[PDB]
Design a protein around this ligand. Structure first.
Ligand SMILES: [Cl-]
Ligand SMILES: [Cl-]
Ligand SMILES: [Zn+2]
Ligand SMILES: [Zn+2]
Lengths: 224, 217
């Protein structure tokens, strides 16, 4: 009974069935991901990202993950959150106005209390991405892992939909603070393809979930 | 049987009372909460309210409740939630920027998908309020008159404030208080048996709250 995104006995349709920890995958009223169609415009969020060497780059639970030493942070409303990892989904899991991207990255953060702030940004096919370099190369070796350009990773000025949701994979824990960033980065078709290859050419995209009038704001901030 | 006392059958122990109530503890979007940080917007709510005779006016589970035939609605984002009842709380369960009110009413709605939309308004002891009377003596209720013409509200995602504490509830909490007379305040509260039915503020996992304005009529 190991969960996956395959439409068989162990898919998303049935995560709630595989363990009793996963019940909130079906019973939960703030589940991710969803379609960002309806939101509110408006006017808080501070980025402390230094280029860092991963403490490890690996395949786990259908995703490609880079973990970090807790030297990086996000500050949202005085509360502080440290970057734990960056992992990937193909295709992108959240949908902005029913538009799909081929890939997205998730910058998971935690506070000392374990509350999560997750940061989602999407990828489209095109220009080669410098910043992917140490991850594609870091995954081939357990290495003195080369640094990732975190401060340079996502746009300086950014527009996002902030809302509360859940983890997008079991155990689908809610209370998660989602910041989904409208502007996609580009990725080489080769770059994209080996990422897909390295996630075992098998998509790790949870289906959009029942939305119970989720209150979404669209806003702006600066990430440098 | 659940209560609001600081003893053994209370809010800090509601989940323990049944398995269905376990979300009361484990939930990550429980209500009430204190409305302190919020976004501002300049962008959707249509009231189809009518003076309506109550199908029943009764006390259930610590509250004063008036139920209705499914003839009143609220339109939100192209869906229509129908009104089932209004009930009261003393004191007011939700807080706005830390301010407290002696009483509140909740207007409970359901859509086609069963999704909840609940409206809360605060009261302040002042002038005799006409709209309470049809309830208090129990008369049609002037739903059309009950709420201010123009409202500033807070909107967010929470839950029922009483067992089973279900989530996915679309709260609209109106800043502008209505008035109530002390003769109304005593009588209504004593119909509530001088047991304050106000659930304590729950943990707040960074609830995304918007401030907006609307016309109720
Ligand atoms: Cl995503
Ligand atoms: Cl209230
Ligand atoms: Zn993810
Ligand atoms: Zn209530």
């Amino acid at each position: 009974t190991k969960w996956d995104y395959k439409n068989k006995e162990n898919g998303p349709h049935r995560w709630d069935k595989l363990h009793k920890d996963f019940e909130v995958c079906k019973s939960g009223k703030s589940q991710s991901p969803i379609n960002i169609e309806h939101y509110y415009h408006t006017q808080d969020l501070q980025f402390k990202y230094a280029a860092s060497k991963p403490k490890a780059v690996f395949f786990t639970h259908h995703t490609l993950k880079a973990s970090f030493e807790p030297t990086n942070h996000i500050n949202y409303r005085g509360h502080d959150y440290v970057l734990d990892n960056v992992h990937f989904h193909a295709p992108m899991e959240f949908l902005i106005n029913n538009k799909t991207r081929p890939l997205s990255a998730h910058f998971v953060h935690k506070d000392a209390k374990g509350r999560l702030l997750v940061l989602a940004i999407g990828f489209e096919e095109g220009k080669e991405n410098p910043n992917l370099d140490p991850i594609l190369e870091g995954i081939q070796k357990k290495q003195n892992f080369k640094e990732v350009a975190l401060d340079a990773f996502l746009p300086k000025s950014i527009n996002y939909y902030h809302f509360n949701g859940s983890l997008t994979a079991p155990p689908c824990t809610e209370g998660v603070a989602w910041f989904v960033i409208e502007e996609p980065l580009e990725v080489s078709a080769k770059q994209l393809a080996e990422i897909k290859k390295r996630m075992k050419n098998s998509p790790n995209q949870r289906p959009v979930q029942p939305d119970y009038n989720t209150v979404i704001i669209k806003s702006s901030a600066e990430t440098r």
